[PDB]
Scaffold this active site. Structure first.
Site, PDB file in Angstrom:
ATOM      1  N   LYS A  10       0.831  -1.200   0.000  1.00 35.73           N
ATOM      2  CA  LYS A  10       0.000   0.000   0.000  1.00 35.73           C
ATOM      3  C   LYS A  10       0.870   1.256   0.000  1.00 35.73           C
ATOM      4  O   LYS A  10       2.050   1.219   0.344  1.00 35.73           O
ATOM      5  CB  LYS A  10      -0.942   0.045   1.200  1.00 35.73           C
ATOM      6  CG  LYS A  10      -0.294   0.338   2.530  1.00 35.73           C
ATOM      7  CD  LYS A  10      -1.339   0.497   3.651  1.00 35.73           C
ATOM      8  CE  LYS A  10      -1.971   1.866   3.673  1.00 35.73           C
ATOM      9  NZ  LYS A  10      -0.903   2.890   3.831  1.00 35.73           N
ATOM     10  N   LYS A  15       7.712   0.986   0.447  1.00 37.97           N
ATOM     11  CA  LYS A  15       8.236   0.275  -0.720  1.00 37.97           C
ATOM     12  C   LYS A  15       9.532   0.900  -1.229  1.00 37.97           C
ATOM     13  O   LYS A  15      10.522   0.196  -1.454  1.00 37.97           O
ATOM     14  CB  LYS A  15       7.207   0.254  -1.855  1.00 37.97           C
ATOM     15  CG  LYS A  15       5.939  -0.524  -1.550  1.00 37.97           C
ATOM     16  CD  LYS A  15       4.991  -0.500  -2.751  1.00 37.97           C
ATOM     17  CE  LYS A  15       4.517   0.886  -3.151  1.00 37.97           C
ATOM     18  NZ  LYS A  15       3.851   1.607  -2.028  1.00 37.97           N
ATOM     19  N   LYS A  41       4.188   8.576  -8.092  1.00 35.69           N
ATOM     20  CA  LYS A  41       4.952   9.517  -7.272  1.00 35.69           C
ATOM     21  C   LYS A  41       6.339   9.769  -7.859  1.00 35.69           C
ATOM     22  O   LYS A  41       6.881  10.872  -7.720  1.00 35.69           O
ATOM     23  CB  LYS A  41       5.031   8.988  -5.838  1.00 35.69           C
ATOM     24  CG  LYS A  41       5.400  10.013  -4.771  1.00 35.69           C
ATOM     25  CD  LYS A  41       4.945   9.528  -3.398  1.00 35.69           C
ATOM     26  CE  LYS A  41       5.546  10.350  -2.257  1.00 35.69           C
ATOM     27  NZ  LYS A  41       6.910   9.875  -1.868  1.00 35.69           N
ATOM     28  N   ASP A 129      -2.150  -0.117  -4.362  1.00 35.02           N
ATOM     29  CA  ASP A 129      -3.432   0.236  -3.759  1.00 35.02           C
ATOM     30  C   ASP A 129      -4.597  -0.214  -4.625  1.00 35.02           C
ATOM     31  O   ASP A 129      -5.696  -0.475  -4.121  1.00 35.02           O
ATOM     32  CB  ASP A 129      -3.477   1.744  -3.592  1.00 35.02           C
ATOM     33  CG  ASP A 129      -2.424   2.241  -2.644  1.00 35.02           C
ATOM     34  OD1 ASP A 129      -2.525   2.022  -1.421  1.00 35.02           O
ATOM     35  OD2 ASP A 129      -1.435   2.797  -3.157  1.00 35.02           O
TER      36      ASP A 129
HETATM   37  N1  LIG Z   1      12.058   1.240   8.463  1.00 31.59           N
HETATM   38  C1  LIG Z   1      11.753   2.563   8.495  1.00 31.59           C
HETATM   39  N2  LIG Z   1      12.030   3.347   9.563  1.00 31.59           N
HETATM   40  C2  LIG Z   1      11.718   4.663   9.570  1.00 31.59           C
HETATM   41  N3  LIG Z   1      11.092   5.310   8.563  1.00 31.59           N
HETATM   42  C3  LIG Z   1      10.751   4.621   7.444  1.00 31.59           C
HETATM   43  C4  LIG Z   1      11.064   3.192   7.349  1.00 31.59           C
HETATM   44  N4  LIG Z   1      10.630   2.765   6.132  1.00 31.59           N
HETATM   45  C5  LIG Z   1      10.071   3.833   5.518  1.00 31.59           C
HETATM   46  N5  LIG Z   1      10.163   4.928   6.292  1.00 31.59           N
HETATM   47  C6  LIG Z   1       9.631   6.248   5.941  1.00 31.59           C
HETATM   48  O1  LIG Z   1       8.276   6.018   5.551  1.00 31.59           O
HETATM   49  C7  LIG Z   1       7.938   6.994   4.552  1.00 31.59           C
HETATM   50  C8  LIG Z   1       7.279   6.305   3.362  1.00 31.59           C
HETATM   51  O2  LIG Z   1       8.178   5.339   2.825  1.00 31.59           O
HETATM   52  P1  LIG Z   1       8.246   5.122   1.216  1.00 31.59           P
HETATM   53  O3  LIG Z   1       9.306   4.077   0.981  1.00 31.59           O
HETATM   54  O4  LIG Z   1       8.281   6.432   0.461  1.00 31.59           O
HETATM   55  O5  LIG Z   1       6.768   4.499   1.003  1.00 31.59           O
HETATM   56  P2  LIG Z   1       6.051   4.001  -0.365  1.00 31.59           P
HETATM   57  O6  LIG Z   1       7.108   4.016  -1.449  1.00 31.59           O
HETATM   58  O7  LIG Z   1       5.534   2.616  -0.014  1.00 31.59           O
HETATM   59  O8  LIG Z   1       4.957   5.015  -0.641  1.00 31.59           O
HETATM   60  C9  LIG Z   1       9.213   7.694   4.148  1.00 31.59           C
HETATM   61  O9  LIG Z   1       9.240   8.930   4.863  1.00 31.59           O
HETATM   62  C10 LIG Z   1      10.302   6.833   4.717  1.00 31.59           C
HETATM   63  O10 LIG Z   1      11.408   7.632   5.110  1.00 31.59           O
HETATM   64 MG   LIG Z   2       7.386   4.944  -3.244  1.00 36.10          MG
END
Ligand SMILES: Nc1ncnc2c1ncn2[C@@H]1O[C@H](COP(=O)(O)OP(=O)(O)O)[C@@H](O)[C@H]1O
Ligand SMILES: [Mg+2]
Ligand SMILES: Nc1ncnc2c1ncn2[C@@H]1O[C@H](COP(=O)(O)OP(=O)(O)O)[C@@H](O)[C@H]1O
Ligand code: SF4
Ligand code: SF4
Ligand SMILES: [Mg+2]
Lengths: 272, 272
Positions: A10, A15, A41, A129
């Site tokens: 999600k 990811k 994104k 999603d």
């Molecule tokens: N293991 C973790 N510990 C702390 N923050 C995290 C961790 N994994 C992800 N984040 C934070 O969560 C937020 C969303 O992660 P992201 O990889 O961009 O999500 P997605 O790509 O699934 O939308 C980002 O701000 C990232 O820095």
């Molecule tokens: Mg992403």
């Protein structure tokens, strides 16, 4: 040969952070890797490129005339550890199908010879999603044989994992797309590791690694870096090295067993 | 007249919980309300109906033959406070367009006379992770004139709010779809209320209410109830009453000003 892996889950679950850190750890080992961003994104490569984001194939094709005016060298960019990076892009909100750029991008990469032989891994970072349009195309058209799902004890994250699993089951009669495992991105809640292990067992797969919540991730991303590059000695860097090792070693690729809403609710009640 | 309102936001942010509790508070005031579920999860009405979920128009049409074999009384169900409830449904993952049920459902409701005159409000609960297909149709086809976005200090939640805002701008030359406000569903982080106020001001709108994180929500939903029904004296019930009052009183409906990624990042750094 190369292993073609897709990361689903999600939005906001982790990811792109997990994929880029996993891939950095693989490159640190000596693997040759390409990341293909399949999320509108379009920031799935910024930590490898030390960048704000990356200009997308959709954007670049529009400025050049057609996608055929583009060359692979214009589109693929190399970052940390020599990891090669590309972003699909997508139409603006309210226009078209949000996944249509994924189809354009994967087809371009295939025809232009991006899947050259000493690549060891390709990772697709895919919005999960909805499982439709171009976001289903890595599963429907047999592009990513190994699906890994990032989730957490969040009910919405487990529902997304179940939905992705249903898409894998739907196309199991063709190609060879399989579920490789769940990756728990911790919300720092009690017994969360046990919950995701239980969910994985019910789906027929495994929890391949539990990623702790660690503020060093934010400190690294503020500086446009993976934790692997930002602080190679951090506890969290060793966590991503452990994930990378288990992904390389993983042999279990299954057609999953999606669960009912009653089973999901029972999981959450059981583990408090 | 009736006010047609749509709740958008990223998955897991709190749309269905906030909408059903807001609507319960409106019914408690004496308003007549209908909820139209426009999320494939299809659990947008279960707290009003005291139910597991609700069977969808897509499912029921398939079992009856065609949508035209369905009657409004078969599809619309009344729950707490007389609130009327319907779910759109959607195709299974990997098949079709995940939003196609939304188009079928809204058209059925219009033709079958569901928008009868002493309704005071209709709320659409819409998936907002992509803005395309049937999920864009409430904006594109002028079905929901007032958009409220649930968000939080999560970067992904603010990006979703910006993306939805871009869709509103795209269709501003036709119909009268406008952004009515942001609703902050708290992650219990410091200065989060100030952050969402700042974001709203940059978009040209307002933060209409700050919803606290309160475990009573989980205790109510375990029992398939809104907080309004489960514990009318709870602190959190008064929060949803305050939101309902401000939604009724809101007069600011704007064509928003989407912001750049640089402005989003500056917001997060500024408010720590
Ligand atoms: N293991 C973790 N510990 C702390 N923050 C995290 C961790 N994994 C992800 N984040 C934070 O969560 C937020 C969303 O992660 P992201 O990889 O961009 O999500 P997605 O790509 O699934 O939308 C980002 O701000 C990232 O820095
Ligand atoms: Mg992403
Ligand atoms: N203000 C709140 N306090 C505590 N829990 C909440 C609150 N709002 C939502 N939740 C919980 O968050 C989860 C997701 O909310 P939901 O309304 O289903 O999200 P969405 O419909 O946006 O996917 C649910 O478990 C819900 O109980
Ligand atoms: S969901 Fe996006 S276009 Fe079908
Ligand atoms: S994104 Fe779903 S079908 Fe277009
Ligand atoms: Mg919902």
């Amino acid at each position: 040969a190369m292993r073609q892996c897709a990361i689903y889950g999600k939005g906001g679950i982790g990811k792109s952070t997990t994929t880029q850190n996993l891939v950095a750890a693989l490159a640190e080992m000596g693997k040759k890797v390409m990341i293909v961003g399949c999320d509108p994104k379009a920031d799935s490569t910024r930590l490898i490129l030390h960048s704000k984001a990356q200009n997308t194939i959709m954007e670049m094709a529009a400025e050049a005339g057609t996608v055929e005016d583009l060359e692979l060298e214009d589109v693929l960019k190399a970052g940390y550890g020599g990891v090669k990076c590309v972003e699909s892009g997508g139409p603006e909100p309210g226009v078209g199908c949000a996944g249509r750029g994924v189809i354009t991008a994967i087809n371009f990469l295939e025809e232009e010879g991006a899947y050259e032989d000493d690549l060891d891994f390709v990772f697709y970072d895919v919005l999960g999603d909805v499982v439709c349009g171009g976001f289903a195309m890595p599963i429907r058209e047999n592009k990513a044989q190994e699906i890994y799902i990032v989730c957490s004890g969040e009910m919405m994250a487990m529902y997304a994992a179940n939905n992705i699993s249903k898409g894998i089951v739907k196309y199991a009669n063709s190609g060879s797309v399989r579920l490789g495992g769940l990756i728990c991105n911790s919300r720092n809640t009690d017994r969360e590791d046990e919950l995701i292990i239980a969910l994985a067992n019910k789906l027929g797969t495994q929890m391949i690694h539990f990623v702790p919540r660690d503020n060093v991730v934010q400190r690294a991303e503020i500086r446009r870096m993976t934790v692997i590059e930002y602080d190679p000695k951090a506890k969290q860097a060793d966590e991503y090295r452990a994930l990378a090792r288990k992904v390389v070693d993983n042999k279990l690729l299954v057609i999953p067993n999606p669960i009912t809403m009653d089973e999901l609710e029972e999981l959450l009640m059981e583990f408090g």
